[PDB]
Amino acid sequence: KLVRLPGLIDVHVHLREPGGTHKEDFASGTAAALAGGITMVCAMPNTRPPIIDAPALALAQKLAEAGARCDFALFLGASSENAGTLGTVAGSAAGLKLYLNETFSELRLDSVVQWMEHFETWPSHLPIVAHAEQQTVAAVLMVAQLTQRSVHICHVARKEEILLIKAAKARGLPVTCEVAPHHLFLSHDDLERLGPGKGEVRPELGSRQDVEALWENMAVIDCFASDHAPHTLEEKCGSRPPPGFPGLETMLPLLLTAVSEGRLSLDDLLQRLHHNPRRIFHLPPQEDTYVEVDLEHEWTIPSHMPFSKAHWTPFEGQKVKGTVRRVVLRGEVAYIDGQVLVPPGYGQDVRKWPQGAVPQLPPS
Amino acid sequence: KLVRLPGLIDVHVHLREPGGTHKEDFASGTAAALAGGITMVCAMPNTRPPIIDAPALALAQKLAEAGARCDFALFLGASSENAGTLGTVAGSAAGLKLYLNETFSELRLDSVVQWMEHFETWPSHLPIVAHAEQQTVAAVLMVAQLTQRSVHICHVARKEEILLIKAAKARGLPVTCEVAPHHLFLSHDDLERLGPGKGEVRPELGSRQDVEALWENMAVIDCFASDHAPHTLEEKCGSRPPPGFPGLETMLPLLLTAVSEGRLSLDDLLQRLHHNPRRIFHLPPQEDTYVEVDLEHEWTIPSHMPFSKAHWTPFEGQKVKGTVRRVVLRGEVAYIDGQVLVPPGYGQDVRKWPQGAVPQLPPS
Numbered sequence: 001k002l003v004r005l006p007g008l009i010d011v012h013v014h015l016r017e018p019g020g021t022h023k024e025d026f027a028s029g030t031a032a033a034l035a036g037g038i039t040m041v042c043a044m045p046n047t048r049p050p051i052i053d054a055p056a057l058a059l060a061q062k063l064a065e066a067g068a069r070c071d072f073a074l075f076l077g078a079s080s081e082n083a084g085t086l087g088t089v090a091g092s093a094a095g096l097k098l099y100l101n102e103t104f105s106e107l108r109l110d111s112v113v114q115w116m117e118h119f120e121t122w123p124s125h126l127p128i129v130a131h132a133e134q135q136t137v138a139a140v141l142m143v144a145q146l147t148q149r150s151v152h153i154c155h156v157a158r159k160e161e162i163l164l165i166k167a168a169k170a171r172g173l174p175v176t177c178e179v180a181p182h183h184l185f186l187s188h189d190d191l192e193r194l195g196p197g198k199g200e201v202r203p204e205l206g207s208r209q210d211v212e213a214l215w216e217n218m219a220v221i222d223c224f225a226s227d228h229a230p231h232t233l234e235e236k237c238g239s240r241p242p243p244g245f246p247g248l249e250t251m252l253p254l255l256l257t258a259v260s261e262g263r264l265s266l267d268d269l270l271q272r273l274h275h276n277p278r279r280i281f282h283l284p285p286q287e288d289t290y291v292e293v294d295l296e297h298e299w300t301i302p303s304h305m306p307f308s309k310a311h312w313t314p315f316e317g318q319k320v321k322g323t324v325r326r327v328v329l330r331g332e333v334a335y336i337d338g339q340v341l342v343p344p345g346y347g348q349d350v351r352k353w354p355q356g357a358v359p360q361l362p363p364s
Numbered sequence: 365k366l367v368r369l370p371g372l373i374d375v376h377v378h379l380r381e382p383g384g385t386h387k388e389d390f391a392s393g394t395a396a397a398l399a400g401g402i403t404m405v406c407a408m409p410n411t412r413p414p415i416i417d418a419p420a421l422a423l424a425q426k427l428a429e430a431g432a433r434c435d436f437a438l439f440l441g442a443s444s445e446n447a448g449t450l451g452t453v454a455g456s457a458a459g460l461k462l463y464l465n466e467t468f469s470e471l472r473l474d475s476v477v478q479w480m481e482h483f484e485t486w487p488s489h490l491p492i493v494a495h496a497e498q499q500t501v502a503a504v505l506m507v508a509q510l511t512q513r514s515v516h517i518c519h520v521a522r523k524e525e526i527l528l529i530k531a532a533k534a535r536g537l538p539v540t541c542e543v544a545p546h547h548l549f550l551s552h553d554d555l556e557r558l559g560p561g562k563g564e565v566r567p568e569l570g571s572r573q574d575v576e577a578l579w580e581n582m583a584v585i586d587c588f589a590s591d592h593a594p595h596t597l598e599e600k601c602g603s604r605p606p607p608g609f610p611g612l613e614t615m616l617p618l619l620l621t622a623v624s625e626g627r628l629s630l631d632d633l634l635q636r637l638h639h640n641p642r643r644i645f646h647l648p649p650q651e652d653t654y655v656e657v658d659l660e661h662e663w664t665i666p667s668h669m670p671f672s673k674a675h676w677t678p679f680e681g682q683k684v685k686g687t688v689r690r691v692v693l694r695g696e697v698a699y700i701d702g703q704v705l706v707p708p709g710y711g712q713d714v715r716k717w718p719q720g721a722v723p724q725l726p727p728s
């Protein structure tokens with residue numbers, strides 16, 4: 001007996017095209033998405049070239065339209081030079097991404113004044129998301145209040161961060177957040193097994209107490225999002241390992257295992273992988289789109305999942321219960337039992353759909 | 365023709381007693397204060413032992429009462445263990461100091477939740493000051509808003525920081541700040557002369573653009589305070605130089621030079637070294653207390669000032685115009701032309717004066 005889910009949405013993926021296509025490209029990354037029960041992804045802008053201007057966005061749009069197998073929206077990235085220049089293309093993007101700490105990213109800003117300039121100039125009705133760790137969460141929340149708008153915090157990983165967000169929500173502040181599966185299912189306890197290179201990720205893996213705090217504060221978590229951050233094994237195991245884990249193919253199986261164990265409900269999962277992503281990012285429905293999962297199937301995560309070019313996974317050896325059996329995307333069979341059945345280019349930019357534009361008031 | 369000033373107040377000094385008395389002690393540091401035209405100082409808690417509990421405060425009070433030559437108040441320091449424990453002694457302190465970044469300090473906190481706990485537990489009517497650099501300024505402002513109270517930002521040193529505070533004030537937020545003389549009168553341009561050890565200070569010396577921004581935004585600066593941070597030349601020039609500059613003896617001459625050049629007015633100076641310190645920290649008046657200065661005397665800062673045990677100065681070689689000629693403290697001549705004339709122990713804890721208690725509403 002399969003369970004039918006709606007088309008799940010991952011609002012934080014790195015698909016590496018343009019410029020990093022040995023790690024992943026639109027075709028491989030969206031195959032990984034479909035195999036993970038994900039029918040829509042929002043791709044981050046830290047590519048090469050980074051998506052920080054209109055010409056780079058135009059290129060990325062075409063590469064995505066040609067390569068994507070599932071539907072998508074593309075983020076713009078904030079830079080030290082582009083505040084006040086993105087107005088004509090802003091509405092065509094998923095939102096604006098701010099990189100406020102050291103990580104795999106033309107995009108760390110050097111001053112909080114630059115953050116303020118982005119919050120002041122980016123259209124007020126469009127999403128802003130931030131990589132903001134530890135005190136940076138409080139800092140960016142202050143900037144959002146000064147500029148009287150909302151902000152979404154990416155990959156929350158620590159007790160400190162979730163409790164700060166909880167306190168902000170208790171004061172009625174417009175903040176939402178997401179959590180990635182590695183911060184729910186891995187911790188410091190796993191670093192011995194992973195080793196120092198594979199274990200590199202930002203935010204770093206947390207203590208058992210961090211992980212426990214995220215679970216205890218599930219009510220504070222608006223979305224799950226993979227932060228699918230593919231790098232090859234050679235890169236992860238080499239002399240300057242880049243941070244990040246692949247995660248599209250493992251996210252849903254990990255979370256279904258948790259549902260089966262009663263750690264959260266099916267509804268809790270679907271709020272966080274479907275309804276809240278839609279409402280925070282104003283992402284449109286996908287007609288005749290659904291995912292069929294088998295909740296009874298027990299399996300062990302192998303040393304690499306079939307689709308991501310990363311060709312490794314930090315979840316190797318974990319026992320999971322739950323598998324994606326079939327995905328239908330806009331009336332076509334997209335995935336069955338390990339086979340992707342839609343070609344590169346089947347996917348579409350949801351921001352071009354009439355229903356995918358973010359509503360806004362008319363010029364004065 | 366001498367100009368009579370009121371008794372000036374320095375709300376940020378490190379007097380090193382207990383535990384660092386080769387660098388300074390209450391007697392030498394307050395001699396330095398008097399020679400700099402300062403009749404009241406607020407001493408920071410990063411001593412050895414640090415002033416983070418009632419017994420340490422009791423010790424420091426007695427050492428100060430016995431050694432101080434000018435009047436004083438003593439800060440308590442926030443630690444990772446003392447939130448909720450300082451209520452009985454809080455009103456006897458200058459205020460609570462939070463160390464939120466790496467510097468010469470049992471006192472960096474590890475989580476913003478610890479900051480929140482201090483803001484929630486410290487009595488709401490008493491001062492809180494923070495060492496908070498760059499984005500940390502925005503973060504601590506967020507914590508202050510979440511807990512609906514004020515905060516004072518120590519030694520603002522950067523364009524980024526003063527502009528953030530300016531934006532907060534424009535939104536009516538209860539934030540005040542101070543600036544130290546080295547951030548007004550030294551910059552990166554001076555690092556070649558100072559060298560890497562002597563030049564170590566937190567916040568670090570800024571660019572010419574940082575310095576220019578502080579001057580341009582003088583209206584945003586509530587107080588001047590030295591951050592007198594004495595260390596010996598051996599320590600500054602050794603293999604692990606501690607950050608900090610001595611500054612009590614040079615602050616007023618530097619600022620008087622600026623007044624003489626029309627960079628700020630005498631009133632601007634007195635707001636920042638007298639009236640605003642009084643009102644932010646609820647420091648009492650000092651009866652029959654004044655400072656006589658000679659505004660015409662030109663001199664060059666020597667390699668060390670006479671009183672601080674630091675026995676060096678980063679302002680060596682700067683030409684100044686303005687000198688402290690006489691200080692009268694509570695009806696006694698305390699300083700004349702290079703001679704301190706009040707003994708260790710003349711100074712008093714202003715928080716013990718009836719007029720030095722911070723006003724508060726009665727228990728419910």
Ligand SMILES: NC(=O)N[C@@H](CC(=O)O)C(=O)O
Nearest residue numbers: 014103104201202229243244
């Ligand atoms: N999270 C990571 O460790 N890496 C991400 C970047 C990011 O989300 O910050 C990547 O693009 O590789």
Ligand SMILES: NC(=O)N[C@@H](CC(=O)O)C(=O)O
Nearest residue numbers: 378467468565566593607608
């Ligand atoms: N400012 C410094 O560089 N050092 C100060 C500490 C401080 O004010 O942070 C000290 O106590 O030495």
Ligand SMILES: [Zn+2]
Nearest residue numbers: 103131154202
């Ligand atoms: Zn990130």
Ligand SMILES: [Zn+2]
Nearest residue numbers: 012129154155
């Ligand atoms: Zn994100």
Ligand SMILES: [Zn+2]
Nearest residue numbers: 012044227229
């Ligand atoms: Zn990311």
Ligand SMILES: [Zn+2]
Nearest residue numbers: 278279282283
């Ligand atoms: Zn909507």
Ligand SMILES: [Zn+2]
Nearest residue numbers: 467495518566
């Ligand atoms: Zn400091």
Ligand SMILES: [Zn+2]
Nearest residue numbers: 376493518519
């Ligand atoms: Zn201070």
Ligand SMILES: [Zn+2]
Nearest residue numbers: 376408591593
């Ligand atoms: Zn200090």
Ligand SMILES: [Zn+2]
Nearest residue numbers: 642643646647
């Ligand atoms: Zn008062």
